[PDB]
Amino acid sequence: DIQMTQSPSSLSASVGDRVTITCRASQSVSSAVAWYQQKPGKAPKLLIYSASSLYSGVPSRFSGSRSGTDFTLTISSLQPEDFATYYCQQSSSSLITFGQGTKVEIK
Amino acid sequence: EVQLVESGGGLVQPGGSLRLSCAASGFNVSYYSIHWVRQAPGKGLEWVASISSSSGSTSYADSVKGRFTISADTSKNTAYLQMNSLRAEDTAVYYCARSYWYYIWSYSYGNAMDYWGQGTLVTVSS
Amino acid sequence: MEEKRLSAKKGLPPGTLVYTGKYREDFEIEVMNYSIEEFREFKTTDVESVLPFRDSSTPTWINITGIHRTDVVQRVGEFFGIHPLVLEDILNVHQRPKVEFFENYVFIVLKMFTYDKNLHELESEQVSLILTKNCVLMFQEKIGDVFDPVRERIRYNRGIIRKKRADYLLYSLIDALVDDYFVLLEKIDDEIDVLEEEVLERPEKETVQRTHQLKRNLVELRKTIWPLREVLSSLYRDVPPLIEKETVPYFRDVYDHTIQIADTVETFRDIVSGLLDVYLSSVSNKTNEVMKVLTIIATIFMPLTFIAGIYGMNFEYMPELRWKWGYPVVLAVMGVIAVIMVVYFKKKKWL
Amino acid sequence: TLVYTGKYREDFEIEVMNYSIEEFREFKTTDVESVLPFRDSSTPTWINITGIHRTDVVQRVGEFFGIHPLVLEDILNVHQRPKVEFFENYVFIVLKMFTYDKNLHELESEQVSLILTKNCVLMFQEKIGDVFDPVRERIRYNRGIIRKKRADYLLYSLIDALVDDYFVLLEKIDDEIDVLEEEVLERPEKETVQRTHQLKRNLVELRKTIWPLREVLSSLYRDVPPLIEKETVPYFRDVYDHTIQIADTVETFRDIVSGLLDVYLSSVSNKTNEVMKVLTIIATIFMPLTFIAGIYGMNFEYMPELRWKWGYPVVLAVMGVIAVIMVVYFKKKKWL
Amino acid sequence: EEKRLSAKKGLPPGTLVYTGKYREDFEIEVMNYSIEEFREFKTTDVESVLPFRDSSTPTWINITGIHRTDVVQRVGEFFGIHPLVLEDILNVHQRPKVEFFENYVFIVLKMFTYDKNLHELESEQVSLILTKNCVLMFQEKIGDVFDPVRERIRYNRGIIRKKRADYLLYSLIDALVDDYFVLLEKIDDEIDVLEEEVLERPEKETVQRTHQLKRNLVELRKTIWPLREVLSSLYRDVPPLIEKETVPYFRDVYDHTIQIADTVETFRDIVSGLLDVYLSSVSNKTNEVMKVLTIIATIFMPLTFIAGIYGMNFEYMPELRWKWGYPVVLAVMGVIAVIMVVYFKKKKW
Amino acid sequence: MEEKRLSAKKGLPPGTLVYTGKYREDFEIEVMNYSIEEFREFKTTDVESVLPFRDSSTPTWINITGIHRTDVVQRVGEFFGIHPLVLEDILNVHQRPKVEFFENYVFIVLKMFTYDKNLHELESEQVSLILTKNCVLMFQEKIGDVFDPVRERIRYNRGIIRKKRADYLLYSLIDALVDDYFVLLEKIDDEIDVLEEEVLERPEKETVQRTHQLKRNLVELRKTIWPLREVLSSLYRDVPPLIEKETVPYFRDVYDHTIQIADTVETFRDIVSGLLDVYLSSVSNKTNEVMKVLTIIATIFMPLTFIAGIYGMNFEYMPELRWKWGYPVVLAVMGVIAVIMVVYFKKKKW
Amino acid sequence: TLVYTGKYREDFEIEVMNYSIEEFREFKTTDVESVLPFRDSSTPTWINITGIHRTDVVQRVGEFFGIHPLVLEDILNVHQRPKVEFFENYVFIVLKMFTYDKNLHELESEQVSLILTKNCVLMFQEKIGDVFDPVRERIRYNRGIIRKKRADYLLYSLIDALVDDYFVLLEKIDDEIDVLEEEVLERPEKETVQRTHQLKRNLVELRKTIWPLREVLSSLYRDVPPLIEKETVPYFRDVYDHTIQIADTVETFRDIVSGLLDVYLSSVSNKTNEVMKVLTIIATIFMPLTFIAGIYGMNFEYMPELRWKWGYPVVLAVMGVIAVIMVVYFKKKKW
Ligand SMILES: [Mg+2]
Ligand SMILES: [Mg+2]
């Protein structure tokens, strides 16, 4: 199948800074990458679909970019409500796969 | 308005089959795909199965292929997951999500999960 | 042609419909049911309240804004007897305007255009119409349309729209769309007026970027206006049983308006080609001027260095200490050749 | 109804002319003391109001003469496209007057409002002076058949005079087009692109004004209102034909200017090629000669400068002959 | 300025000022004919055509040289012709059109003559009027295209003799349209030779010639498009004056006019492309010229630089015939020139 | 003047039969009288074997290949009661594609094109179809037709060509012509791609020569294509009594095909219009590369010879004379200057 | 005569897969005479000829299966387009496989021929390796319903596998275009525009190959020969729509690439301005200086400039002054 390697595995950042998380697909996915956010102990909340578009009902600070097989999520200015675990997901094929996650901590 | 609610979780011995039901409220299951997502305790999200109620076309992950079984009942608006031959590492919380297809190019499509269920914990031990 | 089957695309369930678009933010259903003496109008978000309007004696107008919800459009198509392929064309956005006739309804695809001066973006939004026996269904893509005049006419009992059936409603909607095309064209007029002076005064990279993006925009406008003309031609030259003969004369005006629009688009293309020619001419003139400077310097100071080297070589036999020790006549030669070159350049009307 | 754009503001004026087969009268006036000629139902009466600063008189004639007041806003603003109304008992049209100055190529606009009521014609203008005054001679000196028809032949004459004004304006613009064309063909200029751009924009404004005026005259001709006696419709036919001819002439002017644009571009490219030719010729003439002079300028100590028929005339002749050989080599290529 | 000004000033509509430049000769030619009879004469007396207004057999009055206003005024008054269309007839700068009246139909057309050496198009207005059983036409000067019509009506070739004046009007229009075809042939030959010249031997005069040709083509459209419109109006309206079993001929002439319009549009497209072809040729010439300049400079800049840097006035030169220094340096210059030139002809320069 | 003379029949009575083409070497008549159970083929060079077919009760396809023999056309028109105007329109090769409806027959003038890859010229052949009662008279000027699939369908029942009347035969002919238009369009698209590659990569004089040839060919092709839409629209919308009102959807299909053809032609025209500008910019790019080479050489070697001349000027009391060693210092200075200038030009950007 | 046109002349092998509902026999042999009697098996069979450069084997196969030699010429004519030929005995199809590698941005094809005879399919490849491995797995391990059907469904499966390979190639090209968009909208250069040209040529070749493929599928499902038979037509109808998807994607990619190339290429005259400004500001301030050096480097006896109050520093000061004023003047001209 397709393995979606997500880095960094754990990021530490205070409030008010730009945070970038990247995930690389093993093979080509035609921009069919979604980004989900999960607070500890809650169901995941979708943030990004089509690797660039913004889901209806999320803050505009979240942004998604694609370069080849490198898909990046950027938060322009963090908030105390944005410290959660972020997962990639490729959906180009019928068998979809998730990333290993990127917990965002504080300083 | 839209709500996804799971049930059927609980302690089961290895090799014992239990059925997980994903009650769908606020939408018709016939017009949308239903995906199950398994998250091991302390681990990341993992996809396990999927169903398209309109045509009855399934898709299973390689880790549960041929062992699990997913079915959707449009009459009662509920999608059922049957887990036979349940093994030790399958202990996890199972989420039921409703996905929508979007368009990227004329040859490529992708699906994204809008709404997720509460998630029921399945424990296999003792 | 063929038997009007489903597409059955790859990497996708055999019998599912996918919204081929970008806007997934808003959804609403506005029902406006008007009669000779009274009317109702409401805006909801549940499809179960709009279906019983299918068997309505009075004409009604059901505007579903937001087609990213495939469930609501599928339910509407199932209730109103719409063919699944027609639903697929409704959801598919990347297609030119077109018209199709069926037994119980006529299905039309048209496009709205919004020109944002900031970033100079020409956004295209599909709008689909289905004229049934009594009701007119309009599927939009997002909040925002050009049918406010029609809504005002229906609400205020202005015009003759309140005493005519749904075919006149379809005519009014198409007329409003074609009228808004004229506002789009005049916005193109204004933007081209802005562009021309920048092209002929500040020839930089952003200028040609805008010019080429606008050439593409006008190509798109032609490619979307010609099918609209064909749609209207088929509309007033066919007369399906859904539309009555008393409304056919109203479509000829819309056809003439689209003819005028196409002529304006052709004029726009000619102006765009001329503007690109202007840019090329101005840039070539600037390089010609700097090139004048270079060639003037080179022409004046090359033979001077040549003769300096000629009289600077180490040879045994110099007829050099003659005519006042040689140097003044050499300086006079430099002066006379320099003034000859300057005069010759002046005779050519540059420097 | 209240305020008008008025790019230029001048003095107020009104004039009235009552003409018939035998008797004629005319008055020059500053106020509305001409109430009796209004609604007199007598022989055609032509009233001109120059300057609309005092909108009070406009309102006074708007309630004295039926106007459907919702059109006063259309009348007052001067920057509006020509258009025709089909009201009963009075027909209202708007026609734009164009003025051209050779010193500064600007098409000055002066909106003109025609209102025709029963045996009366009314003229709102906004600046002193008009192209309509030749018609006045027909009213005064009794030439033509203008003094035998009921206020509709007068309207036809006014529209014909405005069309003739457009004709003379097109003649002036044609002269400017010819002079620009000969300037471009003979000797290209740096800012002549400014002149041709000004010509193009003037032509596009003329086109945008002419087309709706074509439509106005077409509506006036084809569907005849009851006010026209059906005897002056053939007179409107020639005005419509003149409008058609004017539109065709404007289109031809646009096309010829567009061609002149690319002619100028080609001239620029040719002159750049000429610069290439002259610079290349000079460089290739004087680089080898300079190099030979330099290499014979080597200090060193070993050289057959002595003997060998000396060196000075030898080098001065070999340089000349090689220069002539390469010049006549360029003569084969026909450069200079 | 110029003589050809499209101005008649503020003259009253009942004025008959002739806005032309031809005052050569004035003749009146009558060609009365029937199925079994034929007549023809030329004169200069107006009253001689007085009884032809009500003649039963079709007649063809041809008044050439309309600069004397008396003959035109008398003809218009005698035949019940509106003075407005009289001044339309006399005016030369008038676009083609049909006007339908109760008793007559009035048409304006233009003949074109092309001067090849001057590449000059000039026009001549002809006004046709068909009234009951008589067609009468006013011309500018002597010479026209209807000579084949005269030969056909003289020798009785075709069905022109066994028809009414409607067929005569159709024959005149057909001959004029054929004149347009031959004019477009001449223009096509000129376009072909100009295209060959610009493709093979570009020159500074080529752009001026192309501009003149574009002017000629737009002046051609300015009259041909009204010709298509006027033939379309004549075909579709079909007033009772124009009889049945004759309108198919007008349909054929309308087809000829639309074909002519399409051909002229094609000519304009080709001429528009020609100037871009010339620009491409000029760019190629510039490329070659600067290739020559660059190769010369690249070959002979290092040589003079080396000569300068080995020929200053320094006492510390290690070049007092170290190992035959001057032959070495000259051979080095030659080898550098060879290495530089062999690098070229590999880059195609 | 070549064989493009429109002045043919300049001075001539209307209805005069004159052939204006350039093919006068061949002639044949093919008659195909097909019924529901039998079909009969026939080949001849004499009309009198072909005339008695106008009274048949079954569809009959008459293909008269070679119209230079105007006697055959005149005899056919006289027997079928054809207007002489229609006959001279048949014999006029330069006739615009058109359709005319008469009381008994429907007259159609169309064109088929031939594209030669070896010699890029677009040749045209005029075909006149007269649908009269249960007969379809075909007039053309040379052997070689795109109607062979229709002949195969008639001979071997690959469809319902034999189950319908002559109007369906006219349909099949029009559809075959439109299919030929499609194949010609794809060949022209291949030529478009070849010329685009050439202008992008290797500009030359033959490049603009062929581009101009292609532009003229496309202009002529579009001029021919546009009236075909009107011809099919007339055959579709205002159905004459000759068309049996059952083939109308088929004519709608052909009308849609013509719409597609016109759209493709417009796209090709836009590409051709951009082609010459692309060529000009490519030539400018090559000149720019030569420009970069020239300016690099000039910048590297002009200041160096400047400094050499500065140190070569001679006079007494030279500060640079009596120096430690003049040559090493000057050579190092010029080497540093050249190195930094090369880093500026060739290493960084050029 | 039979002549091989391609350039792959190093591999040859015959692969036979004879499968029934309950039995399967797969083997690899290099003898043409051993595989000939496989027509006797009523069950469908699949014969794969990997090497075309050995013309004897294909000649013998055509002789035994009875195919008119024009199809042999078409098979050996590698430079071609996908095409379909119908006969009363067999169906002939010419298709093209594609290979794309990300590192070296180049595209190479490989013509593949298929012949469908009564209860038999023959495929002629050009080299080791193909895209029909999933079909082989399905036949071998009894995954789908391929065993229960005849050779027409086998031809279906082969064409479907080829179309899936086309989809994979389209994914690779999509990644390439997504990289190139930023690469040319951020840092344009000669290498980037060369890559754009190569991508445009690859897209042109891909469309020239995909359009005849759509025509072949249309002819395959529209007018059905008796060999195809009804039960397979609904399957063949899907591949046509798959080709529609591929063609639409190719059109979109070609439009994007053409637009990007035009956007870059319409900015050459500004580079001309820049290089002219550079050359002018460099050669304008050095020709006067070299001229001054030439004047003061002449071999004139008793020249006035012998020694005048530090003449050398004065001359260099004058040259510096003129160079400074000239370089300052150019800033006033915005160069
Ligand atoms: Mg004729
Ligand atoms: Mg010296």
Give dist(CA C214, CA C218) in Å, integer. Answer: 6
SS3 of residue E317 by DSSP: coil
Query: A56 vs C22: CB contact, 8 Å cut-off?
Result: no
Cα-based distances in Å from A75 to A17, A19, A41: 8, 5, 22
Give dist(CA D129, CA D118) in Å, integer. Answer: 26
Q: What is the 3-state secondary structure (H, E, C) of chain C?
A: CCCCCCCCCCCCCCCCCCCECCCCCCCEEEEEEECCCCEEEEEECCHHHCHHHCCCCCCEEEEEECCCCHHHHHHHHHHCCCCHHHHHHHHECCCCCEEEECCCCEEEEEEEEEEECHHHEEEEEEEEEEECCCEEEEECCCCCCCCHHHHHHHHHCCCCHHHCCHHHHHHHHHHHHHHHHHHHHHHHHHHHHHHHHHHHHCCCHHHHHHHHHHHHHHHHHHHHHHHHHHHHHHHHCCCCCCCCCCCHHHHHHHHHHHHHHHHHHHHHHHHHHHHHHHHHHHHHHHHHHHHHHHHHHHHHHHHHHHHHHHCCCCCCCCCCCCCCCCHHHHHHHHHHHHHHHHHHHHHCCCC
Assess if CATH 3.40.640.10 describes domain G14-265: no
**Strand-strand pairing, G24-29 and G45-49:** unpaired
Give dist(CA A29, CA B102) in Å, integer. Answer: 14
DSSP of E181-209, one letter per residue? HHHHHHHHHHHHHHHHHHHHS--HHHHHH
**Strand-strand pairing, A10-12 and B68-73:** unpaired
Are B55 and C15 contacting, i.e. CB atoms less than 8 angstroms apart?
yes
At E98, which amino acid appears?
A: V
E242: DSSP letter: S
Two tokens, residue G137: 């797995």
Cα-based distances in Å from E47 to C238, E50, E78, E132: 59, 5, 10, 20
DSSP of G106-131, one letter per residue? EEEEEEEEEEEETTEEEEE-SSS--S
Return the ligand number nearest the Cα of E145.
1
Two tokens, residue F102: 């008469």
Which helix (H) or strand (E) segment holds residue E304: the answer is: helix E247-309
Task: Find, among C200, C212, C198, the residue nearest to C286 by Cα.
Answer: C200
**CATH superfamily assigned to domain G269-332:** Magnesium transport protein CorA, transmembrane region (1.20.58.340)
Task: Find, among F302, F303, F287, F300, the residue nearest to F342 by Cα.
Answer: F300
DSSP of F240-299, one letter per residue? -TTS-SSSHHHHHHHHHHHHHHHHHHHHHHHHHHHHHHHHHHHHHHHHHHHHHHHHHHHH
Are F108 and F231 contacting, i.e. CB atoms less than 8 angstroms apart?
yes
Assess if CATH 3.30.460.20 describes domain F28-282: yes
Taking phi over 0 as left and psi of -120 to 50 as alpha, with beta for the rest, D113 belongs to beta
- Residue A12 belongs to a domain with what CATH number? 2.60.40.10
SS3 of residue G173 by DSSP: helix
Each domain of chain F, given as residue ranges in start order, spans 28-282, 287-349
What's the CA-to-centroid distance between E227 and ligand 1, angstroms? 17
Are C22 and C46 contacting, i.e. CB atoms less than 8 angstroms apart?
no
Question: Which of B36, B68, B113 to substitute to test the interface with A, most A CBs within 10 Å?
Answer: B113
F349: DSSP letter: I
Are F300 and F338 contacting, i.e. CB atoms less than 8 angstroms apart?
yes
Q: What are phi and psi of G34, to 5 degrees?
A: -75, -30
**CB neighbour burial string for G48-61, b if at least 16 within 10 angstroms, e if fewer:** bbbbbbbbebbeeb
Give dist(CA F161, CA E87) in Å, integer. Answer: 63
Q: State which residues form the domain around A79.
A: 4-105
Contacts of B29 (CB under 8 A, 6+ apart): B53, B72, B74, B77, B78, B79
Residue linked to tokens 């080509």: A28
Task: Find, among G120, G20, E310, the residue nearest to D299 by Cα.
Answer: E310
Two tokens, residue B45: 């999200």
Contacts of D239 (CB under 8 A, 6+ apart): D156, D159, D160, D163, D217, D221
CB nearest B113 (choices: A31, A46, A99): A46
Q: Locate breaks in chain A with C to N over 2.5 A; list the residue preceding each.
A: none
F contact chains, 3+ CB pairs < 8 A: C, E, G
Task: Find, among D107, G331, D198, the residue nearest to C201 by Cα.
Answer: D198
Q: Resolution, rounded to a tenth of an Å?
A: 3.2
At D242, which amino acid appears?
A: H
Burial (Cβ within 10 Å: 0-12, 13-18, ≥19) of residue C36: exposed
Nearest residue of F to residue E297, measured between CA atoms: F294
Determine the straight-line distance between the first and last CA of chain C, rounded to whole angstroms: 71
Two tokens, residue F109: 């003038």
Structural domain total, chain B: 1
Q: What are phi and psi of D92, to 5 degrees?
A: -120, 125
What's the CA-to-centroid distance between F306 and ligand 2, angstroms? 14
Give dist(CA C29, CA C139) in Å, integer. Answer: 9
Q: Residue E11 CB: number of other CB atoms within 10 A? A: 15
SS3 of residue E161 by DSSP: coil
What's the CA-to-centroid distance between F13 and ligand 1, angstroms? 6
Give dist(CA D249, CA D255) in Å, integer. Answer: 10
What's the CA-to-centroid distance between E248 and ligand 1, angstroms? 13
Total CB pairs under 8 A between chain A and G: 20
Give dist(CA F278, CA F202) in Å, integer. Answer: 12
Cα-based distances in Å from C173 to C36, C147, C176, C178, C254: 19, 6, 5, 9, 11
N residues, chain F = 350
Q: What are phi and psi of E219, to 5 degrees?
A: -65, -30
Q: What is the 3-state secondary structure (H, E, C) of chain D?
A: CCCCCCCCCCCCEEEEEEECCCCEEEEEECCCCCCCCCCCCCCCEEEEEECCCCHHHHHHHHHHCCCCHHHHHHHHCCCCCCEECCCCCEEEEEEEEEEECCCCCCEEEEEEEEEEECCEEEEEECCCCCCCHHHHHHHHCCCCCHHHCCCHHHHHHHHHHHHHHHHHHHHHHHHHHHHHHHHHHHCCCCCHHHHHHHHHHHHHHHHHHHHHHHHHHHHHHHCCCCCCCCCCHHHHHHHHHHHHHHHHHHHHHHHHHHHHHHHHHHHHHHHHHHHHHHHHHHHHHHHHHHHHHHHCCCCCCCCCCCCCCCCHHHHHHHHHHHHHHHHHHHHHHCCC
Beta bridge partners of E135: E60, E130
Q: Does E287 touch chain D (CB under 8 A)?
A: no
**Strand-strand pairing, B109-116 and B3-7:** unpaired
What's the CA-to-centroid distance between G324 and ligand 2, angstroms? 27
Structural domain total, chain A: 1
Assess if CATH 3.50.50.60 describes domain C290-347: no
Give dist(CA C171, CA A64) in Å, integer. Answer: 43
Determine the straight-line distance between the first and last CA of chain B, rounded to whole angstroms: 40
Task: Find, among C108, C309, E234, the residue nearest to G297 by Cα.
Answer: C309
At E182, which amino acid appears?
A: V
| CATH for the stretch E27-281 | 3.30.460.20
CB nearest C317 (choices: D201, D297, D310): D310
Are C116 and C137 contacting, i.e. CB atoms less than 8 angstroms apart?
no
Question: Which of A27, A28, A29 to substitute to test the interface with G, most G CBs within 10 Å?
Answer: A28
Give dist(CA F210, CA F188) in Å, integer. Answer: 13
Q: Does G172 touch chain A (CB under 8 A)?
A: yes
The correct CATH number of D13-266 out of 3.40.190.10, 3.40.50.620, 3.30.365.10, 3.30.460.20 is: 3.30.460.20
Return the ligand number nearest the Cα of E160.
1
Measured on CA atoms in the order F330, F331, F332, F338, is the torsion positive or negative?
positive
Task: Find, among D49, D40, D45, the residue nearest to D75 by Cα.
Answer: D49
Q: Considering the domain F287-349, what is its CATH architecture?
A: Up-down Bundle (1.20)
F22: DSSP letter: S
- Considering only CB atoms, which chain B residues are within 8 Å of C19? 101-103
Give dist(CA F252, CA A33) in Å, integer. Answer: 45
Task: Find, among E213, E173, E208, the residue nearest to E189 by Cα.
Answer: E213
Which helix (H) or strand (E) segment holds residue G17: the answer is: strand G14-19
Give dist(CA E113, CA E123) in Å, integer. Answer: 7
Two tokens, residue C129: 């119409």
Task: Find, among D75, D179, D167, the residue nearest to D122 by Cα.
Answer: D75
Two tokens, residue C334: 């430099």
Q: Considering the domain D267-333, what is its CATH architecture?
A: Up-down Bundle (1.20)
Determine the straight-line distance between the first and last CA of chain F, rounded to whole angstroms: 53
Give dist(CA C297, CA G28) in Å, integer. Answer: 80
Give dist(CA C10, CA B101) in Å, integer. Answer: 13
**CB neighbour burial string for E289-302, b if at least 16 within 10 angstroms, e if fewer:** bbbbbbbbbbbbbb
Two tokens, residue F334: 């010029």
What's the CA-to-centroid distance between F19 and ligand 1, angstroms? 13
Give dist(CA C208, CA F281) in Å, integer. Answer: 13
Two tokens, residue E87: 């001044």
Q: Calculate how close chain E gets to F25, using CA atoms only, in Å.
A: 27
Angle between helices F248-312 and C205-236 (to 10 degrees): 170
Burial (Cβ within 10 Å: 0-12, 13-18, ≥19) of residue F25: exposed
- CA F320, distance to chain mean position in Å, is 76
Query: B52 vs C11: CB contact, 8 Å cut-off?
Result: no
F110: DSSP letter: E
Q: What are phi and psi of D123, to 5 degrees?
A: -130, 100
At F91, which amino acid appears?
A: L
Q: Does G327 touch chain F (CB under 8 A)?
A: no
Cα-based distances in Å from G20 to E332, G145, G147: 82, 11, 6
Which helix (H) or strand (E) segment holds residue F107: the answer is: strand F105-115
Q: State which residues form the domain around B12.
A: 3-124
Query: B110 vs A92: CB contact, 8 Å cut-off?
Result: yes
What's the CA-to-centroid distance between F137 and ligand 1, angstroms? 24
SS3 of residue B101 by DSSP: strand
Query: G174 vs B108: CB contact, 8 Å cut-off?
Result: yes
